[PDB]
Symmetry: C4
Subunit: 305 residues, 4 copies
Amino acid sequence: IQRYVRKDGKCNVHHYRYLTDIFTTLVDLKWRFNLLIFVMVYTVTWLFFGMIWWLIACVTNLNGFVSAFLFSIETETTIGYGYRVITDKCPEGIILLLIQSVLGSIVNAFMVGCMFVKISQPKKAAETLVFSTHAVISMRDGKLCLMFRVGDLRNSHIVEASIRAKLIKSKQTSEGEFIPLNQTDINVGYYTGDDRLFLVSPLIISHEINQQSPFWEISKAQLPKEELEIVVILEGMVEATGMTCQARSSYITSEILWGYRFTPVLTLEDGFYEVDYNSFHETYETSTPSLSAKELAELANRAES
Amino acid sequence: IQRYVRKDGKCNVHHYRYLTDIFTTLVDLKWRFNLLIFVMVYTVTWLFFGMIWWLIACVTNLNGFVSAFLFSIETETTIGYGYRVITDKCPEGIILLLIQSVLGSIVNAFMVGCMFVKISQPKKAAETLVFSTHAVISMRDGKLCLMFRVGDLRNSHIVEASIRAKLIKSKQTSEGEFIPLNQTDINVGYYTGDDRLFLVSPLIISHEINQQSPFWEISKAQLPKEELEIVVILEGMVEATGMTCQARSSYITSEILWGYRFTPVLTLEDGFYEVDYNSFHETYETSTPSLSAKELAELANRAES
Amino acid sequence: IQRYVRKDGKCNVHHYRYLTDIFTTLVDLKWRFNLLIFVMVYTVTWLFFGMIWWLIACVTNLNGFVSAFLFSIETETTIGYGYRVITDKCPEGIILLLIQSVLGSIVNAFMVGCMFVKISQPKKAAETLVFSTHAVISMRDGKLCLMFRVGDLRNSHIVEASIRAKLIKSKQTSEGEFIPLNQTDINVGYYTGDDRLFLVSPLIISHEINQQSPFWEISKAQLPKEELEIVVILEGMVEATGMTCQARSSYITSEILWGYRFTPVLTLEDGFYEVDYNSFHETYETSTPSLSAKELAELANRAES
Amino acid sequence: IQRYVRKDGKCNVHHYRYLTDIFTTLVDLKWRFNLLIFVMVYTVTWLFFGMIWWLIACVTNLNGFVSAFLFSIETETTIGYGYRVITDKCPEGIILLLIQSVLGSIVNAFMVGCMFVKISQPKKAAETLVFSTHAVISMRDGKLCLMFRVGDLRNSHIVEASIRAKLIKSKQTSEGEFIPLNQTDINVGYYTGDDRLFLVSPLIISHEINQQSPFWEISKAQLPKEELEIVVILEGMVEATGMTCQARSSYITSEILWGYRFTPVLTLEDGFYEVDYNSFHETYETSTPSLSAKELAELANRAES
Ligand SMILES: [K+]
Ligand SMILES: [K+]
Ligand SMILES: [K+]
Ligand SMILES: [K+]
Ligand SMILES: [K+]
Ligand SMILES: [K+]
Ligand SMILES: [K+]
Ligand SMILES: [K+]
């Protein structure tokens, strides 16, 4: 069975009713459509209001249908060339112009506010956030760890960030209840506050595999047989702009390399630090026990001399 | 006595002074009124400023009252047809136009900013968030649990979210002090960070009923006799738009089904995952102890062979 | 010596350099000044640009100084009456109009964005938040507690909120180092998550005075002799508008009543709940030990029969 | 090797692809460039659209190239002087004006929204936040502490804030894996909630050096030999404006003074409190053990009489 979360963050699960937030529907559109909406939205008002001037036919230099348009438009954009102006003969025309120019300001506001979000939406910001292409399991100061690399491709922004991971795996309860996509938080710094990143250079996020880890009894041999997927979420804030952004990826069982290690990316240069973003996804192997974490602990606690 | 929080989130408790944030009063209005405000707001300025042109009567082609309006309007919307223009004979008229066109820009700003929030307000966003219609109590890996289902009806948005629950119940302290609506947080993931949802598909939020649970000594038999209400709060963020949203529901004692279980909603399809949102509210029963959690623990701790 | 934080939230401590955020300086102004800024800001541009038209004197119907203004204004607000229009005789005038109408759009943006925040700033929102006028110390299910009341005067908004309190008191370290306003967090729900309020009706925030409380050894007799001040902070979110708000108050030693209790405010009405906001600040006394919490615990632990 | 984080917050690490968020690229620009962009952006549209009027040559008083501009401009800014107006002879010209005035409103929105953020961006706000120029290590109620001073130079804003610190130091794991910039959170209030500042007056942030501190075995003698750097992050919220801001500094090994103490800044004045911001960075020495924290604890635990 395929994956739940793609490496680019999108899910693989499918769900009229969403008309509750049409605005949200409007921002997620590609520009081509978005403009086309606004093209239409303006015409339909200019059609409607023009057809009320012709119902009112106060008028200067107006003939067939086409003539009322160039006015209704020039009135609403507030152009008013002066070839088509207003008289005071009728009560009706003089008040339409007010409702029109009030309402013309509404449509503009729906548009400006509409545009702001569209340009300001930070999905674009978080596009420079990056997760290592694989995860690794290997030893680190005696303890076996699951590790992935995190980083932002721009220097200038989002240095504050925070990381979290969920393990998605099927489960059957003792009572035989089946949970297809049961999920459990994977400890990556929460209790100590080490999940609050400071993205100077790309970081290796580590999860120490201990008695509480879902990974406690997985050995090297078991891993390939396990059907599990780690979703990895990063939420940070753009320095230049208050707003916050999410970025996610996934690691499926076969993208977890046992007994590897991440290539360093940071190196010294003419008395400076340069991040070699080419070694970003790069790993390498090292002698690493084949045993589960649980069995390592046991072996270790029985060696006390 | 009736409920405190309706299933749609609104409270059932009633509280001039709120004139402190008139802006907030303005957004919570239904459009019909909102536009009517702005209709009025524009007229009253056009009335006031027009009545200052007539006090100043610099003027071109102006007769009775109606004539000053079409100018004051055309000056403030900055139409200026050119049938009614300005001369330099008077000092007063030339400076009014500046205060007017400065002030006309203020009113517009109150309106645009007013509209932005109105369209952007995320009450509409959170309308697709949904809580199961009931809660269930039943066993799960040996431990008795209170469970409700959570989900968002759209795929495209708010996948990050976070859940919390409060129990509302009357209390008398030993000292005899009476607390009508005493509330206590109900553990749904806080300590482990499992209250930070990832809404791929609708989730069963679980509360394990343990020595700290307010539900520790409620048996199946007791439950119906208890007068309690669980308020359930969900706060997440719209992917497409930075802003965050709240959604709430309530479960009153009679909407807690003892010995049931939630129908799975997720199923496989042609090598894919589809959420059958029809089974969303659906539960079913299973053999489940009738005992309180406290008495189960006891019975269990005395069985150690 | 007087208080550090007034009951309305403002501090009593005094601190050119703040020109770093002139925008922030602009919003905190009272409207009278704010408008006066914008009045001036517009004139000074209309003065400058008009004086560049007169340097360029492309022109129609322009005499003395006053004539260039009504154009520069009509060009920048984009009125353009058509009594003063443009010719193509000069290269200079034709390009000024572009820089002008580009720059005129900048000033407007500084103003609209300036206004938005001014109206949207939520200091006004949090004005309906309210703290009890006093705090009380008295017993509650065996444990001695410090309690203050919290609430929002509007029904319609900010039901989610969160509370925190700091105790400000002078300190000398063993090493004799003097800390005038040393502050310590006062536990009001943090560890259990009970500091995450749900403001249905006004709540009694409680702090259980235990071995970790700064209040552990204060008896009834000691209290008046103590020189301490509790600052109380409330941060919630306006339902109708995403943004968050702070509200603070203070309790100084003499506003802590020992052996009292808050009048209930909530009562039943024709099968409903009504909050009697008149009893909001109201307390009353009850028989309450005079002893410190520490000495109560001792007396209690020695009574085990 | 030099420092990772400058005292003003900027990093010393270097990283086309950033075209993903051009908007963010646009705000981080200095005004000179920003305006120049908008100058250009407007001209290029006025060039393009003017060249479509000349392709359409509906026209009044239009000669060479220069004449179409003053129209295309007056149409898009919606000036329309009335010397160059529209006729109904052609179908094409009448519809261009609509696409033009729709599209003219788009460019404006990109600009206004562009300006808002630029003025509202809070990098400017956080410029008044300040960190002591050094850190100190010395004793405090028996426990050895690392201390730095924090404060905001304005009274009127950002009183709520929150502090966090990371220690950056090289590491080699037992397995010989090398971590150049390994970082660990430094405890400054997280567990007790004392990292949630209330910036009445500048505060001394303290980190008690205990068995969990990275500083546990550093003695006075060792310190100078250590190659370590403390990054210090402050995130608070501007009262007058909802938005939040980050401010950072760094302390490198030689800016940690052993056996010093911060000069008090707060003093009493005519029955008031005044902060003498001149003594802000000022420290002074006091008799302080030369031993590491670890060795002090030992010596202390062996003295129990
Ligand atoms: K925690
Ligand atoms: K005109
Ligand atoms: K916690
Ligand atoms: K905590
Ligand atoms: K205009
Ligand atoms: K005009
Ligand atoms: K005009
Ligand atoms: K914690």
